[PDB]
Enzyme design. Structure first.
Site, PDB file in Angstrom:
ATOM      1  N   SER A  15      17.785 -23.782 -21.303  1.00 44.12           N
ATOM      2  CA  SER A  15      18.922 -22.904 -21.650  1.00 44.12           C
ATOM      3  C   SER A  15      20.158 -23.757 -21.853  1.00 44.12           C
ATOM      4  O   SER A  15      20.111 -24.955 -21.642  1.00 44.12           O
ATOM      5  CB  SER A  15      19.165 -21.862 -20.596  1.00 44.12           C
ATOM      6  OG  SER A  15      19.437 -22.489 -19.370  1.00 44.12           O
ATOM      7  N   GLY A  16      21.228 -23.124 -22.310  1.00 46.16           N
ATOM      8  CA  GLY A  16      22.379 -23.783 -22.914  1.00 46.16           C
ATOM      9  C   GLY A  16      23.392 -22.701 -23.374  1.00 46.16           C
ATOM     10  O   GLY A  16      23.186 -21.504 -23.188  1.00 46.16           O
ATOM     11  N   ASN A  17      24.486 -23.156 -23.977  1.00 43.92           N
ATOM     12  CA  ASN A  17      25.525 -22.254 -24.460  1.00 43.92           C
ATOM     13  C   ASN A  17      25.047 -21.395 -25.627  1.00 43.92           C
ATOM     14  O   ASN A  17      25.478 -20.254 -25.786  1.00 43.92           O
ATOM     15  CB  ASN A  17      26.773 -23.042 -24.864  1.00 43.92           C
ATOM     16  CG  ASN A  17      26.438 -24.366 -25.524  1.00 43.92           C
ATOM     17  OD1 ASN A  17      26.570 -25.427 -24.914  1.00 43.92           O
ATOM     18  ND2 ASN A  17      26.001 -24.308 -26.777  1.00 43.92           N
ATOM     19  N   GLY A  19      21.813 -20.139 -26.402  1.00 45.57           N
ATOM     20  CA  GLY A  19      20.955 -19.032 -26.025  1.00 45.57           C
ATOM     21  C   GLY A  19      20.011 -19.614 -24.991  1.00 45.57           C
ATOM     22  O   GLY A  19      20.440 -20.291 -24.057  1.00 45.57           O
ATOM     23  N   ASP A 122      22.286 -37.726 -32.258  1.00 42.95           N
ATOM     24  CA  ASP A 122      22.194 -37.407 -30.857  1.00 42.95           C
ATOM     25  C   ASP A 122      20.845 -37.914 -30.317  1.00 42.95           C
ATOM     26  O   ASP A 122      20.127 -37.198 -29.558  1.00 42.95           O
ATOM     27  CB  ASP A 122      22.322 -35.884 -30.827  1.00 42.95           C
ATOM     28  CG  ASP A 122      22.540 -35.311 -29.384  1.00 42.95           C
ATOM     29  OD1 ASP A 122      22.360 -34.075 -29.179  1.00 42.95           O
ATOM     30  OD2 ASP A 122      22.858 -36.098 -28.460  1.00 42.95           O
TER      31      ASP A 122
HETATM   32  C1  LIG Z   1      12.778 -27.453 -22.946  1.00 43.00           C
HETATM   33  C2  LIG Z   1      11.374 -27.738 -23.325  1.00 43.00           C
HETATM   34  C3  LIG Z   1      10.511 -27.843 -22.298  1.00 43.00           C
HETATM   35  C4  LIG Z   1       9.219 -28.136 -22.537  1.00 43.00           C
HETATM   36  C5  LIG Z   1       8.305 -28.318 -21.378  1.00 43.00           C
HETATM   37  C6  LIG Z   1       8.784 -28.305 -23.811  1.00 43.00           C
HETATM   38  C7  LIG Z   1       9.645 -28.171 -24.870  1.00 43.00           C
HETATM   39  N1  LIG Z   1       9.107 -28.342 -26.109  1.00 43.00           N
HETATM   40  C8  LIG Z   1       9.746 -28.370 -27.270  1.00 43.00           C
HETATM   41  N2  LIG Z   1       9.087 -28.632 -28.287  1.00 43.00           N
HETATM   42  C9  LIG Z   1       9.700 -28.725 -29.391  1.00 43.00           C
HETATM   43  C10 LIG Z   1      11.000 -28.469 -29.557  1.00 43.00           C
HETATM   44  C11 LIG Z   1      11.639 -28.103 -28.439  1.00 43.00           C
HETATM   45  C12 LIG Z   1      13.032 -27.861 -28.392  1.00 43.00           C
HETATM   46  N3  LIG Z   1      13.831 -28.126 -29.292  1.00 43.00           N
HETATM   47  C13 LIG Z   1      15.007 -27.903 -29.163  1.00 43.00           C
HETATM   48  C14 LIG Z   1      15.934 -28.176 -30.265  1.00 43.00           C
HETATM   49  C15 LIG Z   1      15.307 -27.424 -27.944  1.00 43.00           C
HETATM   50  C16 LIG Z   1      16.615 -27.077 -27.388  1.00 43.00           C
HETATM   51  O1  LIG Z   1      17.434 -26.538 -27.938  1.00 43.00           O
HETATM   52  N4  LIG Z   1      16.910 -27.450 -26.211  1.00 43.00           N
HETATM   53  C17 LIG Z   1      18.165 -27.156 -25.617  1.00 43.00           C
HETATM   54  C18 LIG Z   1      18.056 -26.594 -24.238  1.00 43.00           C
HETATM   55  C19 LIG Z   1      18.938 -28.375 -25.364  1.00 43.00           C
HETATM   56  O2  LIG Z   1      20.137 -27.661 -25.216  1.00 43.00           O
HETATM   57  S1  LIG Z   1      13.831 -27.329 -27.135  1.00 43.00           S
HETATM   58  N5  LIG Z   1      10.996 -28.109 -27.328  1.00 43.00           N
HETATM   59  C20 LIG Z   1      10.936 -27.873 -24.634  1.00 43.00           C
END
Ligand SMILES: Cc1cc(C)cc(Nc2nccc(-c3nc(C)c(C(=O)N[C@@H](C)CO)s3)n2)c1
Length: 255
Positions: A15-17, A19, A122
């Site tokens: 989570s984050g600002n 959503g 980033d």
């Molecule tokens: C947070 C998380 C936990 C786990 C165990 C797998 C994942 N897997 C995963 N796979 C592919 C893409 C993503 C994600 N991509 C973005 C841009 C994400 C995202 O916005 N994260 C935000 C919380 C950082 O503010 S998560 N995420 C993500």
């Protein structure tokens, strides 16, 4: 645009600002597991998805599409083991040979991002997602910028620890700006996901960099790899190597 042939789970992966990020499934009669960025501006989310749309690389996270429902939803293939820094904090058994393969995978997806004239902006150990212990992917294109066909850099957070001096002093971002971040990404990788420049503020990091002081060699890091980091952390961009040359060195020392 995707349909809601999509089932979300309840837990928040994160989570984050913006959503909150949840796990889900997109039915195509083989279902795909997916990670989903839901907003709680949209324009940013649309930007970020626009970037992912033009990208296609075994070492970049894929976008599946956008889903426009009860909330705006960015849908991506799911990297099951999550963030590099986090996995590494909790798998200190991971061996040097294996960290080198993971970063060589990053450099390869970065090599491609440079050829396609995008800047990531980033690039950090928190933005590299693990498919398996042996398969890494770059993520979070929220601050990425497509370069125009005429320019070599983009003119502007921020993640100041990962930033090159030209970014902080001039606001120019180029692919050799991201080479600098990759050097910090590699140091976090060899350090098993410890924060870089501990206890130091932005302006203290900047001051430290201007003196010509770099971060130390991590504990079990091979010397070639640390020399690779100092190369990456070339102060002057004109002389800093692009990912063509970072990736070549990394591929070499791997065999
Ligand atoms: C947070 C998380 C936990 C786990 C165990 C797998 C994942 N897997 C995963 N796979 C592919 C893409 C993503 C994600 N991509 C973005 C841009 C994400 C995202 O916005 N994260 C935000 C919380 C950082 O503010 S998560 N995420 C993500």
């Amino acid at each position: 645009l995707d349909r809601k042939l999509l089932t979300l789970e309840d837990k928040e992966l994160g989570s984050g600002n913006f959503g909150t990020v949840k796990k889900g499934y997109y039915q195509m009669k083989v279902v795909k597991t997916v990670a989903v960025k839901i907003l709680k501006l949209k324009d940013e989310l649309l930007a970020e998805a626009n970037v992912m749309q033009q990208l296609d690389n075994p070492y970049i996270v894929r976008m599946i599409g956008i889903c426009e429902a009860e909330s705006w939803m960015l849908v991506m293939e799911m990297a099951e083991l999550g963030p590099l820094n986090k996995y590494l904090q909790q798998n200190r058994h991971v061996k040097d040979k294996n960290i080198i393969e993971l970063v060589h995978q990053v450099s390869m997806g970065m090599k491609y991002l440079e050829e396609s004239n995008f800047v990531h902006r980033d690039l950090a150990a928190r933005n590299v997602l693990l498919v398996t212990q042996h398969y890494a992917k770059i993520s979070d294109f929220g601050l990425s910028k497509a370069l125009r066909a005429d320019e070599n850099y983009y003119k502007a957070k921020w993640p100041v620890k990962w930033y090159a001096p030209e970014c902080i002093n001039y606001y120019k971002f180029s692919s050799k700006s991201d080479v600098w971040s990759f050097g910090v990404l590699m140091w976090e990788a060899f350090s098993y996901g410890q924060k870089p420049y501990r206890g130091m503020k932005g302006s203290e990091v900047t001051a430290m960099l201007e003196k010509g002081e770099r971060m130390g060699c991590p504990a079990g890091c091979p010397r070639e790899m640390y020399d690779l980091m100092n190369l990456c952390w070339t102060y002057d961009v004109e002389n800093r190597p692009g990912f063509a040359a970072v990736e070549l060195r990394l591929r070499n020392y791997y065999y």
